[PDB]
Symmetry: D2
Subunit: 481 residues, 4 copies
């Protein structure tokens, strides 16, 4: 076994250590070739054909770049080849838990199919990783390259999911190596190599000329002591670039990841999966059969759960799958559920997850006072609530970043928002509410618009942008508008 070189369009030629190659050449990893990074986004942005596989390689590569850069500039950190390989492996493997169409699966499908369960792709990644290691005899190979499976497997899982009270909650590495936990999935502030890869890769595919300059950030990164931990610190000068990184993230969510049509296509696919869930069988361990919604309980079954489910349903002839198949066929003909509009709660108002189901009922209960041919019911409405933030709810992630200055490179400091600019956001979280109608004819749509705008007025939400055009009889009643 020797190093392989791979040509990636984002990073160029990258070198992979043979242990990494061994982990990649498994069914559990190769699975990620059949899961679209952006899920239903490909149905809106035709360049977004990329899958989780190539993203994972990039994350693994960038994780290696950063840990090598720190070790070269600061030999006193005693970063070992063992540390480098463990960080790269965590980087490679943090996307292993994604399901069909990525965020569709755990953001929409699982919550509806298994409301009792608490599932995230991160937990899935840890379980899949364990299954990958055990199923393929990787532990001996790890030992052969100087890794200590007991500690290092724990370290890898902690890097992905966080600690499995205390000053130091981690067991895989001690406080003097704290900075290693900030590379792959940064729980403190969200600044990690996962974002850096997807910014560049998603932009390249989407046709958007945006990214964060990660090479710059790597050149200016240092490890300093912060409250008895050794942490990664950014050069003070870079603070503006970090605010820009979160702005870019939010832009990409607005333009692409939460595109109103990309979301409704995800919703339609989720609907098809719900109607197919009783009939599709996935074989897991010992020949046991699982459903789409229960394959998450057996990694051997989950290994075989990919975007392929979409086509299996679409190409089925079984009459049982007729309803699921019809929804997918509507997607192919582009007969989609119709977007009605968008609004936001005002100021500090927030809607909660428990209430999401009551919203279609509220919209249908509005009493516009316009002449309507058709009356709509709760089941005709879809109400999608989207949380937009800087990765930490209402918190400013830059308040959780440590910096150093050129005159004192070993001394960590904090920089507040007011020390940077007044042109920055005054809030770091908000909600968008999108309403769609499942009845697509002209009269239903007209009615849906009247209900929607009336509902906005009753709730004191913001005036939809086209409110005066879509509901000219409703908007005058609200003088605030």
């Amino acid at each position: 076994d020797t190093m392989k070189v791979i040509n990636d369009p984002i990073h160029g030629h990258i070198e992979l250590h043979p242990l990494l190659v061994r982990i990649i050449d498994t069914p559990q990893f190769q699975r990620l070739r059949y899961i679209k990074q952006l899920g239903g986004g490909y149905y809106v942005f035709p360049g977004a054909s990329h899958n989780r596989f190539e993203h994972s390689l990039g994350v693994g590569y960038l994780a290696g770049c950063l840990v090598h850069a720190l070790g070269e500039k600061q030999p006193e950190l005693q970063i070992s080849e063992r540390d480098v390989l463990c960080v790269q492996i965590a980087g490679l493997c943090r996307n292993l838990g994604h399901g069909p169409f990525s965020h569709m699966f755990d953001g929409r499908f699982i919550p509806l199919a298994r409301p009792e369960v608490k599932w995230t792709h991160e937990q899935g990644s840890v379980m899949m990783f364990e299954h990958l290691i055990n199923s393929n005899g990787i532990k001996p190979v790890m030992e052969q390259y100087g890794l200590i499976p007991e500690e290092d497997i724990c370290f890898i899982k902690e890097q992905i999911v966080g600690p499995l009270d205390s000053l130091w909650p981690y067991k895989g590495r001690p406080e003097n190596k704290s900075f290693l936990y900030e590379i792959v999935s940064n729980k403190r502030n969200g600044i990690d190599v996962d974002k850096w890869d997807y910014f560049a890769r998603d932009c390249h595919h989407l046709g958007i000329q945006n990214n964060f300059d990660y090479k710059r950030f790597i050149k200016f990164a240092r490890v300093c002591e912060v409250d008895n931990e050794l942490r990664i610190c950014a050069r003070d000068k870079e603070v503006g670039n970090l605010y820009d990184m979160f702005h870019t993230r939010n832009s990409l969510h607005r333009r692409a990841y939460q595109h109103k049509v990309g979301n409704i296509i995800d919703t339609m696919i989720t609907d098809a999966f719900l109607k197919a869930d009783d009939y599709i069988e996935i074989t897991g361990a010992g020949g046991k059969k699982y459903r789409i919604s229960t394959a998450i309980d057996d990694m051997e079954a989950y290994t075989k759960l990919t975007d392929n489910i979409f086509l299996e349903i679409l190409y089925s002839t079984d009459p049982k799958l007729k309803d699921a198949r019809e929804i997918l066929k509507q997607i192919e003909y582009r007969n989609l559920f119709k977007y009605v509009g968008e609004t936001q709660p005002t100021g500090q108002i927030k809607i909660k997850r428990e209430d999401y189901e009551s919203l279609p009922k509220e919209v249908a209960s509005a009493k516009p006072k316009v002449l309507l041919d058709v009356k709509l019911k709760a089941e005709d409405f879809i109400v999608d609530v989207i949380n937009m933030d800087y990765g930490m709810q209402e918190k400013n992630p830059i308040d959780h970043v440590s910096f150093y200055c050129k005159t004192a490179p070993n001394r960590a400091i904090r920089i507040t928002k007011n020390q940077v600019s007044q042109l920055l956001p005054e809030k770091f979280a908000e909600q968008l509410i999108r309403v769609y109608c499942k009845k697509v004819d002209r009269k239903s749509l007209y009615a849906a618009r009247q209900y929607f705008v009336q509902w906005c007025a009753d709730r004191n939400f913001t005036k939809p942008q086209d409110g005066d055009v879509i509901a000219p009889l409703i908007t005058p009643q609200k003088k605030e508008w």
Copy 2:
């Protein structure tokens, strides 16, 4: 129905006429979302995740750009809006006939599964197009936008497949130039290549050196031997030689990558072993096989890269052998590359002889001590034709040019008027040999047979010949 705008990473924001949108939003077109452009290339170049769908949009767009440019600069050509839409439709629809993993399907699988049949993706595209039109009531919609379905459907098909004396019925000789946009049968210079150069390069991580926007700006129609043809400005001749050089480079680096090809071969093998057991429902509920779905477009509509995963995730014992080959791909236990050579002789190895080659390699008698003896079935011999798109012919001899001082007068430019640094030949064959036995001793043996076979046949010395077979290469003084 109004115009839609779509954001493509290669071309930016593209406008699509509502008739094109109607054609795109069908099962027959959306199918192309599930067919990788480069087939097994994705298993070597991880950026090559692109499908035929987005390439097709780009071809349709570029076809529109060129026909509009010609009309704007030369109103006397009388290009109509109807002509523009017909050219765009042919551009959109020329990839409709591709099968699972694109060139794998018609280059490898069909020739082995149905040796008696003569199938190309082009023929498939015309059949798929007909089925798309009829199944979705597109003819009325065509009429609504000023098209004449009888003549225009014929024109569209002719643009894709050629003629079904002026041999075309969809347009007359004064619109000859319209047949050169989408699939140029005369010299291969068409908008299909322009899109894939730029798109494949973007995804592969290689830089494209052909500038189609430049070419469009300098393109004119001129009279050539009583046809109106597209002519390039004389200055551009160098750039055209470069276009074919780029195509050849892309084939060498990516499309004929030795591992990408062997993955395609392994997938083909899995399909052959699955062909008796996979069922695809076509018209009237009739069942077809992977190899017969080409006979029914309703079945072919459902034949995509999904077949790979249906096999890989199957539990049926009948599919065990097919499933095992695909599992070898996932663990990267691939058939092993042995080497590459070329004929020195000017006769091309013929397609009819391809099957006899593994036998010849196994019949070589290398004078070397060997632990293991290999059989014909252990060898794969892949013959690859590399050319400038027209066998031995120089495609630039079939291009017409014009000069700045006389923009309507077509001229010819010969190779000697351009450069002495150009190719003296325009076609060649590469022969790759692989071994299905992957252990160290089998591979060592395979190398000895291979080099011996090269020597016996008077093929070129493999590049690593002296390293892989030091006992064999001395016997050939032509190599020393």
Copy 3:
């Protein structure tokens, strides 16, 4: 006939023969010798680009937008004459720039000729007039169907604004034509679109804003009895992003602290050279660097070349100017001390800029200092950052249309878009530098600077606790 030019940003661009005639003049070719980013090239070595190529791009984009509107809306009656006039204004709006672009009118002219009110825009109109008259362009304009009297006026108005409906070059039904090249209402114009893409390409920063997308969605609608360009409603987020990008590019590149100090040092050299450099203008009359703006024939010859003429001079009179430039070549630059901002209400006025080095030197930091610094040792640079319209939100001055009613213009407020947007649209940055570069001077400069920030109630410099640990504790507001 038409010429084709290969531009790295826009690809192959077609130029109408009238445009080619305007380009092939000394007044336009001059722009080949003026760096777009001035002193920015001394920090970003990719930023070698000049005003010339930017001007070609602006002219091209202006043509793209006006063609797109005419094709989608024939009822606007956009003529070939209108298209050429818009392209010419686009080509010629950078004609008035001086040596190192914004250095010249942002730093040098204000200091050299404080009484005068000069902008590159005014310079562009004067240069344009001189270009036309000196080269016999009026007849050529007539030959392509232009009407010089009206159209020259239209071109100038597009660049500088009005020289009721205040414009004479075109009537209210063609109002939308005045929004293409230099948009006085909200700053959304093709000049920005070119520089975003060109500057990013050269600087090594990824250039946001998709102007092709914007062009596809642009329409003309009636707004308060004018025909104006309206954006599709869904594009409002992209417009906020466009201004965010602009502000980023200023923060990272155009107001780079070292780029700015190099501009300051070059300005200083020009001031010390101003009495001795002679530039021949009309009728053989001699001008100075600071007075060449009064004669276009002299101004034609005033480019980045002045830098090298000073640097390579042997005249003892130019010794002081030459020494400053030589310090730039050895990279013995004035040293950056830090940055701060005013707090709460406070805004620093232009009239007070000169008093600021005095104030910094007057601070009494309670720390032991080896050296005492004087006002002349400090440079204080005040930078106004905004979204192009002072305290105003430029998106409040944009008109939108919806898909369901394409001819009905609407307004969209900030609250209808996002709560993650800026609450303010203007601010000031204050950078302090020290002309004394040794270790002890620098240490002292830092103590003064932080003390001054404290006394004035400015924001705590980012590295305040590190550079002045004895000073920052005294301020509870800072912790």
Copy 4:
């Protein structure tokens, strides 16, 4: 003090060792900010505003990348930090000798102004480098970072210009044979495959608006040092041979499209003409206040330091009546009243035009007797004849015959690969000449006449038929059966 980071649009953020920063921050290096990489090319490709300065940084960076990669993969080579810095410095400093408008200066101007002298930008770079070091007290700073100035300065100069003595045997003194591979990085005298090309391919393409086909990062990953005929040399992986042929194809493409663009060349020619007419009157101050001319500034590095593209503007903005003729030529460039391109041809078969004959060519063109009615008669002085040598960097030789390869199964064993083992679609020849003819008389009747003379001359000499020959000279081309 410490490393600086610089943002380059081609390579991204590059780290520079403090010694390199010291060399860069001198008048001798900063001079390269005022010299256009592509000379008169900017007057055709408006994106080509880049200067030699930023190219030099990129060459220095790539030289570092390659030497670091070799050292990391093969510790047994004993590459030291000292070796790395010396290679980077040679990379940074190999463009120091360029004059105004780069190749215009040493390709056109110097050969005409000082025909006796043998001047190349390479020689200029060595002299400039010596002057840079001595004028700025760099030797002590070198010592401070572990360099040994005597041997290392020699090594740096040898990397740029080749052996400084006649050895007639290992001809280099800066490093021994076991470090021979270090001499292949910056300026590869054996086959021309070096980091200088890699930077300019990527940079020129970025600025010109053309896409580059050569991947240097790939090449660096596959490069190894192996023993070849008792030297340690850089070897490429066997399967990279196709990419190397492509690299030379790309170089030839870039020359055809851009560097030898017919108008870019005539602008260079016009600027050269202006410089020749200005050469008696422009003064450049050198060492001790002595005055030099444009053509003699090459003899004093202090003067040469101040000789940049600025000369163009000094002439253009001059008022001295003595500079009137020079100034008028430059003004013609501004108004785009350029000498007119007449056409292009090539010698046939074996014919090779010699440098000594270049001056006789305008006479030959004017001596042609086209059998056509002409209103104007043209003289030798009305014609410019530009002869351009196009090749793969080594005259008639295939540079890939001078490359060593290794195979995956035996990484330490160097091998040769011949053209026939690669492809039949490759060039059969590796050198050729283009002949461009221009007319200084730009009116319609002169141009018509020039075309008739030119095509007649092609016919008389048996050169190739110009591409538009039948269009520009329909009465002349029929007389040549070889063309019909």
